[PDB]
mmCIF file of C-alpha atoms and ligand atoms in Angstrom:
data_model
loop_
_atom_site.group_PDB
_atom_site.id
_atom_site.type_symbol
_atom_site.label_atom_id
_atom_site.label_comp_id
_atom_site.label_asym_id
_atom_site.label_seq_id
_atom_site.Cartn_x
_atom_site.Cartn_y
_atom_site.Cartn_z
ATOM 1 C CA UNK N 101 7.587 -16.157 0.536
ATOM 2 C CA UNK N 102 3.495 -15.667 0.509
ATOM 3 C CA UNK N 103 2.782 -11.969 0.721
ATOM 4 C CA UNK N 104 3.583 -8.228 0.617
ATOM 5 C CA UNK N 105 2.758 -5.138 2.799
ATOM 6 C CA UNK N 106 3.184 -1.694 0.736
ATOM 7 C CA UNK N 107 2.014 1.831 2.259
ATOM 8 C CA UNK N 108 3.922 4.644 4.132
ATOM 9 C CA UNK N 109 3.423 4.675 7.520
ATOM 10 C CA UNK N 110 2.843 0.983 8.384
ATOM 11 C CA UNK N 111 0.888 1.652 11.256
ATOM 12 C CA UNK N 112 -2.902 1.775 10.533
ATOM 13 C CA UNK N 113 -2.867 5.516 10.205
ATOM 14 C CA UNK N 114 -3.502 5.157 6.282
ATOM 15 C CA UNK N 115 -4.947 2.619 3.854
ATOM 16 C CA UNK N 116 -1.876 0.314 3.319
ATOM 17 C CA UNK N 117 -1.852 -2.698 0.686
ATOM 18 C CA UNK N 118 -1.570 -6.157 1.896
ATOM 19 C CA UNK N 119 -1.066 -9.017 -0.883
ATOM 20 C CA UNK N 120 -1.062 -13.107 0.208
ATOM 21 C CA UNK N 121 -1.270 -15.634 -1.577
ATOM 22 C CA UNK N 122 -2.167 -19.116 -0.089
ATOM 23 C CA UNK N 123 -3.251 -22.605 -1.412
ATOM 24 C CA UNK N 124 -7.456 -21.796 -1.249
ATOM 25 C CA UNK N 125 -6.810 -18.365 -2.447
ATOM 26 C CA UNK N 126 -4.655 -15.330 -3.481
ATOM 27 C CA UNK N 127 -6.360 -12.375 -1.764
ATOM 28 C CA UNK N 128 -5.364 -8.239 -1.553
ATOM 29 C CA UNK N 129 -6.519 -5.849 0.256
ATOM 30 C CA UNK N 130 -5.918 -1.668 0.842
ATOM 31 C CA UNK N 131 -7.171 -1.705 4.699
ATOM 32 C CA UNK N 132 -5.917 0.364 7.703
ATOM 33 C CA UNK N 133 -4.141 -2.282 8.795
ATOM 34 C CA UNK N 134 -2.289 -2.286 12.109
ATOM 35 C CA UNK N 135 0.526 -4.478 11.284
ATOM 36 C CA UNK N 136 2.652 -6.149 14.115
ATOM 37 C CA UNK N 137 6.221 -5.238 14.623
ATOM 38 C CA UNK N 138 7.231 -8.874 12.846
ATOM 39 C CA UNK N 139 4.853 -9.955 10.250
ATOM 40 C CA UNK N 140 5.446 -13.449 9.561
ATOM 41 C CA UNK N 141 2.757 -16.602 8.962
ATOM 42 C CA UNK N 142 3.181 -19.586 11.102
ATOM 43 C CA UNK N 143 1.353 -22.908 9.390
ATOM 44 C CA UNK N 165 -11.223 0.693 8.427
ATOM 45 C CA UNK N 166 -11.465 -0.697 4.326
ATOM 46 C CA UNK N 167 -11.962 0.548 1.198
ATOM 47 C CA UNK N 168 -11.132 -2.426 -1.521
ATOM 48 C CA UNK N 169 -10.692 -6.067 -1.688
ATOM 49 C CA UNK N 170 -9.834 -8.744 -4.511
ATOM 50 C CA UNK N 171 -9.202 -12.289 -4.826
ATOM 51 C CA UNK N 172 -8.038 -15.067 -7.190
ATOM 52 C CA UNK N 186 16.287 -24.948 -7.146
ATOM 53 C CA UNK N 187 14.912 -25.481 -10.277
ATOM 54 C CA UNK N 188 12.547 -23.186 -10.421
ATOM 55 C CA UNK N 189 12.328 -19.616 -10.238
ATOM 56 C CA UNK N 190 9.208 -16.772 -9.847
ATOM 57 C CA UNK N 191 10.403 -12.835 -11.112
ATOM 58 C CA UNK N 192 7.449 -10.361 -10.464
ATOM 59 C CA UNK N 193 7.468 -6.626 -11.233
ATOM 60 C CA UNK N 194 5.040 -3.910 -8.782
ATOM 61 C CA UNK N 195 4.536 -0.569 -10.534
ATOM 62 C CA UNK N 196 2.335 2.055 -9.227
ATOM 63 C CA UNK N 197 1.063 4.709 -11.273
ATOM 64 C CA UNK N 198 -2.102 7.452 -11.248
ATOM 65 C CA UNK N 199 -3.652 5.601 -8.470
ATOM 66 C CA UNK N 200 -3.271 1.724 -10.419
ATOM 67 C CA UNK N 201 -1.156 -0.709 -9.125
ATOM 68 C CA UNK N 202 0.250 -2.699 -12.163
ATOM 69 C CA UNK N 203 1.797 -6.256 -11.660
ATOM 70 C CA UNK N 204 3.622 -8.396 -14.008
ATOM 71 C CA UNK N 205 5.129 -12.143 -13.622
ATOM 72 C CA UNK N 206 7.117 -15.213 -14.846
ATOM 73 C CA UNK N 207 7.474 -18.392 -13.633
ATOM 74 C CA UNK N 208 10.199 -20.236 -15.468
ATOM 75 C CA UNK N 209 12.728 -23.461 -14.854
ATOM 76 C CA UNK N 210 16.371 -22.743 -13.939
ATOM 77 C CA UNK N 211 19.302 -24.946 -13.970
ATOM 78 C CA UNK N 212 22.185 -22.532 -12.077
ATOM 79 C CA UNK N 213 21.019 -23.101 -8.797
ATOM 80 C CA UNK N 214 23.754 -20.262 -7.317
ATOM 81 C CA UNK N 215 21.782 -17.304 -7.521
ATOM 82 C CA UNK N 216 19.637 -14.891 -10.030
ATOM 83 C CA UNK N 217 20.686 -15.953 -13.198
ATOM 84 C CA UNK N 218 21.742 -14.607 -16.658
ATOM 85 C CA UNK N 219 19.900 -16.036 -19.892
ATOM 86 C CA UNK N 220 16.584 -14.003 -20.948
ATOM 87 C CA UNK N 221 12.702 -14.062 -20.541
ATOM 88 C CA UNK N 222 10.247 -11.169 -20.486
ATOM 89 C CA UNK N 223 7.201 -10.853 -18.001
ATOM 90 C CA UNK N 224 3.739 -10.311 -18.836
ATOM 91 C CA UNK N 225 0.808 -9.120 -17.065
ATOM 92 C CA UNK N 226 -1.428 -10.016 -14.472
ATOM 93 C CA UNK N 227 -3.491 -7.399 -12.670
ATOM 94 C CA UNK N 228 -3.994 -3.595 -12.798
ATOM 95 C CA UNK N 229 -5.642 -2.470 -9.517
ATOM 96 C CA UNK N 230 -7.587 0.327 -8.628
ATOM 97 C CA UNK N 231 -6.300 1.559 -4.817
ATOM 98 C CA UNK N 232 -5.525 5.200 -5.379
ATOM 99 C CA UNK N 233 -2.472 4.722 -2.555
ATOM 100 C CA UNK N 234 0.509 6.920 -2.130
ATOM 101 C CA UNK N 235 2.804 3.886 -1.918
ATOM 102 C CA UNK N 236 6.357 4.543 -0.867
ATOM 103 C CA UNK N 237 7.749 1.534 1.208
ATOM 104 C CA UNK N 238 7.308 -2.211 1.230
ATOM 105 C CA UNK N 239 7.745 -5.374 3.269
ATOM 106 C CA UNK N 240 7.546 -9.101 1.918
ATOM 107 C CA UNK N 241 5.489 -11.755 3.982
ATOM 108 C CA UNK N 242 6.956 -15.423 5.274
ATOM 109 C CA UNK N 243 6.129 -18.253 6.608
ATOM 110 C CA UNK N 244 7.139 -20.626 8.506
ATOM 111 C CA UNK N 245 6.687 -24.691 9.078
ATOM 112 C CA UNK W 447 -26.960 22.726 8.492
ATOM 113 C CA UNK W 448 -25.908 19.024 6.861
ATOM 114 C CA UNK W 449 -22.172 18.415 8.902
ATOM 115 C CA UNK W 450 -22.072 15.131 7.243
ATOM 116 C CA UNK W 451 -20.448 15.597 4.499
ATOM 117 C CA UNK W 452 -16.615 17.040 4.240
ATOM 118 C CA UNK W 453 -13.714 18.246 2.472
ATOM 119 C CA UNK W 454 -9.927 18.246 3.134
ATOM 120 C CA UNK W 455 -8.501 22.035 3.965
ATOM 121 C CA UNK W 456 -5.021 21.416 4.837
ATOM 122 C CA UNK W 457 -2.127 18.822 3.378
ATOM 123 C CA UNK W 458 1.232 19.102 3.226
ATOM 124 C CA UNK W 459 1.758 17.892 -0.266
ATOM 125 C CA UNK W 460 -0.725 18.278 -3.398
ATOM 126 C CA UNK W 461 -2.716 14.692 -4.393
ATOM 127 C CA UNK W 462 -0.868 13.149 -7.762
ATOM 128 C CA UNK W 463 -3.352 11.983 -9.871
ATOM 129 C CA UNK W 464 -6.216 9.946 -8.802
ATOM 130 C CA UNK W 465 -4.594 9.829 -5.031
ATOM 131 C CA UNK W 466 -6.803 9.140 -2.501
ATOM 132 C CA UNK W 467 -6.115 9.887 1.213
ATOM 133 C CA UNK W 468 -8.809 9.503 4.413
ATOM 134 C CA UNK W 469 -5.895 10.355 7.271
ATOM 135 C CA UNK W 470 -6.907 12.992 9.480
ATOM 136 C CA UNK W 471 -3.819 13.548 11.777
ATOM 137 C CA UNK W 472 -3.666 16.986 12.846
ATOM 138 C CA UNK W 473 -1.772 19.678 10.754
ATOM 139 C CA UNK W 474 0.969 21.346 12.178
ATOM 140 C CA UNK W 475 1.094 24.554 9.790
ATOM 141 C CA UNK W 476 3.759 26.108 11.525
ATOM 142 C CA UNK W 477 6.717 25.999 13.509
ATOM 143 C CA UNK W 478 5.127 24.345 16.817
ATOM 144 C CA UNK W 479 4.505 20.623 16.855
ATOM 145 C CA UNK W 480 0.546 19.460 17.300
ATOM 146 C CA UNK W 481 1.652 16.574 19.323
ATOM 147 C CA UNK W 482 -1.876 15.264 18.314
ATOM 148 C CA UNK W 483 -3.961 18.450 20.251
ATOM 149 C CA UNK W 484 -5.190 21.078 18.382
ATOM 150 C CA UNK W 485 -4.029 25.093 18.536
ATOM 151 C CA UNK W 486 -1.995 27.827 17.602
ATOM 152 C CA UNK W 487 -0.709 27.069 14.527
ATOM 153 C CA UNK W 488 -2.033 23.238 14.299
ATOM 154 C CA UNK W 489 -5.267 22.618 13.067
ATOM 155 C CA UNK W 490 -7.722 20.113 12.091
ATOM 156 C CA UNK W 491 -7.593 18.929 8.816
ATOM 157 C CA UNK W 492 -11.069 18.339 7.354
ATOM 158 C CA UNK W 493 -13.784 20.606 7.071
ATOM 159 C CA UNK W 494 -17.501 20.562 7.003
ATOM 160 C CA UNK W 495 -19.820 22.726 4.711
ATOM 161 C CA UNK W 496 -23.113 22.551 7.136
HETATM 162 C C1 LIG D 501 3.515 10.321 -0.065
HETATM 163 O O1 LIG D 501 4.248 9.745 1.072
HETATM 164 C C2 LIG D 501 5.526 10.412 1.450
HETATM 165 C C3 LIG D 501 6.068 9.754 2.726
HETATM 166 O O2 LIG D 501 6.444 8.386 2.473
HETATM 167 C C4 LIG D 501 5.291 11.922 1.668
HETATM 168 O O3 LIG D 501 6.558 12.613 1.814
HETATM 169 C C5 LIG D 501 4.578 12.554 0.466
HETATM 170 O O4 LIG D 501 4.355 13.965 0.748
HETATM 171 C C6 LIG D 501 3.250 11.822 0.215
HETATM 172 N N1 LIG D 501 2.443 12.500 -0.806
HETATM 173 C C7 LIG D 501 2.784 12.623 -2.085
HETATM 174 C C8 LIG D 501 1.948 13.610 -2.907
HETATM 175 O O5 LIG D 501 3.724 12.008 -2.579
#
């Protein structure tokens, strides 16, 4: 996993949010992006911003025009599948982007 | 008259707060589709104050 699309449309006619994250950078963006019909990595705009043992929990909120995000990053031993046990998130950005969000997409890659 | 500068007439829905929204496919206000050409009952949906 290295990114997320979130917008409505999906199909440049609107600003739609584009997160990635990569090892020189973790970059977002709001553009009119024309996505492709399968977005996947193989190894008009308005704003811009830049920065089994283990497991990452996020949480994407969007309210009055801010896009909130919270994280972890923690250790796990039960390797199955999301696991029980207890740890909060905490916050990382709050994002000015005023769009009407109502679908998502996550990003890939591949070797 | 100054045409450069423009508001939005016609949407569908009402902004929430602090919504922001540049798309200017056509408005159908009415019961026949726009099809992206502009007429009876589908209009354009910015305006200009010259
Ligand atoms: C936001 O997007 C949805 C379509 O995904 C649309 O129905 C709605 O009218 C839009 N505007 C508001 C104010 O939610």
């Amino acid at each position: 996993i290295r990114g997320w699309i979130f917008g409505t449309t999906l199909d440049s006619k609107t600003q739609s949010l584009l997160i990635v994250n990569n090892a020189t950078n973790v970059v977002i963006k709001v553009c009119e992006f024309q996505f492709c019909n399968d977005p996947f990595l193989g190894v008009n705009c308005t704003f811009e911003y830049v920065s089994f043992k283990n497991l990452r929990e996020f949480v994407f909120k969007n309210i009055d025009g801010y896009f909130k995000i919270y994280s972890k990053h923690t250790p796990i031993n039960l390797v199955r599948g999301l696991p029980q046990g207890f740890s909060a998130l905490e916050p990382l950005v709050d994002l000015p982007i005023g769009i009407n969000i109502t679908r998502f997409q996550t990003l890939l890659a591949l070797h | 008259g100054n045409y450069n500068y423009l508001y939005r007439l016609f949407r569908k829905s009402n902004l929430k707060p602090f919504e922001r929204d540049i798309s200017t496919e056509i408005y159908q206000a009415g019961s026949t589709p726009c099809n992206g050409v502009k007429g009876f009952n589908c209009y354009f949906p910015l305006q200009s104050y010259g």
